[PDB]
């Protein structure tokens, strides 16, 4: 299916910042369109988005350069090529950029085209993206509806409260379909607003559509979530489990973990592991993301020995969707799960490779949004088409989050009996 | 272009509540999909959405009944019909529902199908929705890019502060294209966050993607907006004007207006508003009096209407019977257009036309509960409405409309002029 036109444009993301949208047009009239979510433009470890840095537009956050890469050299290199050959398309862009971290054209440019190409190819093949992804994956007809971990309470750098943990999430493991999981999520989300209102706390929402009320401790956040779960008529631990992201790099100083909102105490790597362990005995927390600093591999080795048999230990900053880092982690018994941010790697082909590496090693892959999102819902198709089993795509408000849940609804409706919702067993450590 | 399948489903809106999505499929494969935004389930003046009221699902807010109406009675009535005949398609649904307020099937069911049908027909005709809308409107090839009024600060019932006024908005009138207007909005939006953070105020967002910080008065609210516009490098009154929504019913008591942050008679409240428009470049005032206060509104329109846009929202509820009576009685000079408040594309085109014929302005509006659907962008362009009210510059429920406007302007160029200040009534 020959590519005939590629169009790049600068659109606006859910935080009001520019991002890249691409369209891939094929002979026969087939069109795919996708957008890149927000990412890092500096740093040594992940694929880098290209930003303009022109202070006179969007406070330096323009993406005109990345859009120009799409419309110019990327378009020129891809016109006439076969969109169905995803690896080939991705390789052309990867080689043309020439940098490991896609920092010439920008991972935002390359990813937008990579995804739009895949959508266009699916259309040409008369099938939805999730079906095409399964074919590209060498696992045709193999699907699941992912178990969502849904942002609910924010802290640390993502709030202005005394909660140290960056976010707490609910997982409707007791649901029997993704539609039910979404409804459960919605009901808990609404009951939490009522619970917080009665406490005199603020219920306006953050980037991911959840709450950041002025709670005074990590324990208070867990308690308020438990209360909302009860209010909604669900059973904590059976119907709904908890997941957290510590973003522990945010409190790492001089080789120790200092928690302000815990009386500014300075835990060793081992002590912080046991702090977390105690939380997991007090509440049904079954997944912990970035529970130590990304550099703290000795600490992660210990945390994995102590918690890994019964708790999902998700590397986000730890792995930055990097197969080179993931491979070494696996070799060294570091964590047992990885957050998949496709814009940290920059192409669909490479994203499939990361998901596969995790699965082959018995690690779980959790398909993730970014803080800056769009109306795009490609991660829903990605999670289903690779049968990843889990998704982290926000609270139950803001269409930058809910667009993904709606797409999961459409996909489950279409696939029916062919896309099981497996519930708690998707989570690493849960049988 | 023959309808061969209609599918309704329950999806989730931007506030986490259910709404209706519909697909209309035509012979040859053409498909359109759209969703209803949030609306009213009760009341005697507007079209009503149908809600389930099952306490065990979605706190009683399920839309299974409206979705069933799409999949059953609506589907079978419309299958076989020509999707290009929008008025005919809408007439079938309206007649079948058989009520005056669409309360049998729900305005949510009817609108979702009405819009999805229009998109399907547009696809059959090999054209974008905005182009099809212009043809349906009988104004083929007539377009404009709307001047956005963008939520920026919330107060009243839409906040927990000491601001009486419900909504303050910015209008980037000085922009030359909607793409520029959108950048200007984004820049002011980000500068306001900076200003609020410097004051130790909360910068989390409300339903429309704007801020609702703990401001002590209407005066403080306008002050921070002015500061942000300046910080962004724009001139208030020139590059950017101000619009507001009083929601004046919220302080209406015994025929008087009691603010509790500033007991006005109808005339006295009009002059209170007049005083604000002298002090700040407020050029548009929505629901400046209670919807029932028609003698008050005639007075407000006489006093302010030559120089200020006076937008009926609760006053008109997108109802042409009310708008007609308003026009003849000299009531307001503008109307907010909420397509789910009337319930069909055909009736929406009629409301916009009635407004325009009387010299009133039509402001195409979002609802509090939205989706990623961007139909209102195509609607504003295809009817050359001239103004849009679709949120602050955050949340993709808002920003998806701005993105669609960018896509449309990219295609149309000079064929869809951004006319700026002059779109506003009184300007």
């Amino acid at each position: 299916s020959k590519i005939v036109k590629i169009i790049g444009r600068e659109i606006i993301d859910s935080r009001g910042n520019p991002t890249v949208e691409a369209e891939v047009h094929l002979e026969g009239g087939f069109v795919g369109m996708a957008a890149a979510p927000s990412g890092a433009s500096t740093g040594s470890r992940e694929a880098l988005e290209l930003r303009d840095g022109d202070k006179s537009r969007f406070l330096g956050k323009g993406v005109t350069k990345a859009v120009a890469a799409v419309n110019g050299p990327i378009a020129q290199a891809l016109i006439g090529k076969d969109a169905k050959d995803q690896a080939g398309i991705d390789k052309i862009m990867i080689d043309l950029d020439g940098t490991e971290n896609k920092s010439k054209f920008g991972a935002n440019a390359i990813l937008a085209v990579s995804l739009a190409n895949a959508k266009a190819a699916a259309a040409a093949k008369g099938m939805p993206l999730y079906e095409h992804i399964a074919e590209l994956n060498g696992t045709p007809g193999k699907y699941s509806m992912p178990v969502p971990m849904m942002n609910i309470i924010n802290g640390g750098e993502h709030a202005d409260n005394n909660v140290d943990i960056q976010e707490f999430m609910i997982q409707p493991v007791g649901a029997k379909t993704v539609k039910e999981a979404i409804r459960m999520g919605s009901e808990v989300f609404h009951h939490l607003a009522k619970v917080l209102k009665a406490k005199g706390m603020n219920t306006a929402v953050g980037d991911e559509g959840g709450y950041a009320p002025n709670l005074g401790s990590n324990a208070e956040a867990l308690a308020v979530i438990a209360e909302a779960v009860k209010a909604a008529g669900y059973e904590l631990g059976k119907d709904i489990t908890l997941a957290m992201d510590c973003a522990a790099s945010e409190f790492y100083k001089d080789g120790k973990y200092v928690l302000a909102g815990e009386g500014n105490k300075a835990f060793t790597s081992e002590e912080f592991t046991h702090f977390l362990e105690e939380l997991t005995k007090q509440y049904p927390i079954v997944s912990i993301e970035d529970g130590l600093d990304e550099s703290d591999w000795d600490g992660f080795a210990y945390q994995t020995k102590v918690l890994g048999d019964k708790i999902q230990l998700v590397g986000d900053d730890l792995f930055v969707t990097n197969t080179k880092i993931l491979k070494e982690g696996i070799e060294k018994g570091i964590a047992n799960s990885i957050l998949i941010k496709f814009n940290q790697i920059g192409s669909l082909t490479e994203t499939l490779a990361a998901i596969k590496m995790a699965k082959d090693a018995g690690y779980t892959a959790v398909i993730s949004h970014r803080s800056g999102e769009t109306e795009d819902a490609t991660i829903a198709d990605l999670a289903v088409g690779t049968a990843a089993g889990q998704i982290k795509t926000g609270s139950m408000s803001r269409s930058d989050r809910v667009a993904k849940y709606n797409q999961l609804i459409r996909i489950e409706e279409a696939l029916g009996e062919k896309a099981p919702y497996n519930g708690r067993k998707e989570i690493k450590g849960q049988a | 272009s023959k309808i061969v399948k209609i599918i309704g489903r329950e999806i989730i809106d931007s506030r986490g509540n259910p709404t209706v999505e519909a697909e209309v499929h035509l012979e040859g494969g053409f498909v359109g999909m759209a969703a209803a935004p949030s609306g009213a389930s009760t009341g005697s003046r507007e079209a009503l959405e149908l809600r389930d009221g099952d306490k065990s699902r979605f706190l009683g807010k399920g839309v299974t009944k409206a979705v069933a109406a799409v999949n059953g009675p609506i589907a079978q009535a419309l299958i076989g019909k020509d999707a290009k005949d929008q008025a005919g398609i809408d007439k079938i649904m309206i007649d079948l529902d058989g009520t005056e307020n669409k309360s049998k099937f729900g305005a949510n069911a009817i609108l979702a199908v009405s819009l999805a049908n229009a998109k399907a027909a547009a696809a059959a005709k090999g054209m974008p929705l905005y182009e099809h809308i212009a043809e349906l409107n009988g104004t083929p090839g007539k377009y404009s890019m709307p001047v956005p009024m963008m939520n920026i600060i919330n107060g009243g019932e839409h906040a927990d502060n000491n601001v009486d006024i419900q909504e303050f908005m910015i209008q980037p009138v000085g922009a030359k294209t909607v793409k520029e207007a959108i950048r200007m909005g984004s820049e002011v939006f980000h500068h306001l966050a900076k200003v609020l953070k410097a004051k130790g105020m909360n910068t989390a967002v409300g339903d429309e993607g704007g801020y609702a910080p703990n401001l002590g008065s209407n005066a403080e609210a306008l002050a921070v907006i002015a500061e942000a516009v300046k910080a962004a490098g724009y001139e208030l009154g020139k590059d950017i004007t101000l619009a507001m929504d009083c929601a004046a019913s919220e302080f209406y008591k015994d025929g008087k207006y009691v603010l509790a942050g500033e007991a006005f008679t109808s005339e006295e409240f009009t002059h209170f508003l007049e005083e604000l428009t002298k002090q700040y470049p407020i050029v548009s005032i929505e629901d400046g009096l209670d919807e029932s206060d028609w003698d008050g509104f005639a007075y407000q329109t006489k006093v302010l209407g030559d120089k200020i846009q006076l937008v009926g929202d609760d006053l008109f509820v997108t109802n042409t019977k009310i708008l007609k009576e308003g026009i003849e009685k000299g009531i307001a000079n503008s109307i907010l257009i909420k397509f789910n408040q009337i319930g069909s594309l055909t009736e929406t085109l009629a409301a916009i036309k009635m407004a325009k014929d009387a010299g009133y302005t039509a402001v195409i509006s979002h609802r509090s509960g939205e989706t990623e659907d961007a139909t209102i962008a195509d609607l504003a362009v295809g009817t050359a409405a001239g103004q849009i009210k679709t949120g602050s510059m955050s949340r993709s429920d808002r920003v998806a409309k701005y993105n669609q406007l960018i896509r449309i302007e990219e295609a149309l160029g000079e064929k869809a002029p951004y006319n700026g200040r002059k779109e506003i009534k009184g300007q």
Binding site: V31, E375, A377 | H25, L26, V31
Partner: peptide, 15 residues
């Protein structure tokens, strides 16, 4: 193409 079709939120069902 419509944003719904191009984005892959709706699919063709008929030839």
């Amino acid at each position: 193409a419509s944003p719904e079709l191009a984005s892959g939120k709706v699919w063709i069902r008929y030839p």
